[PDB]
């Protein structure tokens, strides 16, 4: 309520790529990229794995952020 939540959770996803990636996961529609990236993956580039646990988690909480939280 006084700051963000998964936002920085992504801010930490190695600024290299996993960062802007995980952001992608919980940034675009709940399935805008979470899918095209966590579904039709060819060789698991990077945002799909990072942002897959980061996008899925974002969902788990964002829906009813109250219990524990995954990535």
């Amino acid at each position: 309520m006084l700051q963000k939540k998964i936002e920085e959770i992504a801010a930490k996803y190695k600024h290299s790529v996993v960062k802007k990636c995980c952001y992608d996961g919980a940034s675009v529609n709940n399935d805008e990229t979470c899918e095209q990236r966590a579904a039709r993956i060819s060789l698991g580039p990077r945002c799909i794995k990072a942002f897959t646990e980061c996008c899925v988690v974002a969902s788990q909480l964002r829906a009813n952020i109250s219990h524990k939280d995954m990535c």
């Binding site: 190695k14 290299s16 790529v17 996993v18 995980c22 990072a50």
Partner: peptide, 4 residues
């Protein structure tokens, strides 16, 4: 989730 993390990549490094």
């Amino acid at each position: 989730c993390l990549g490094x």
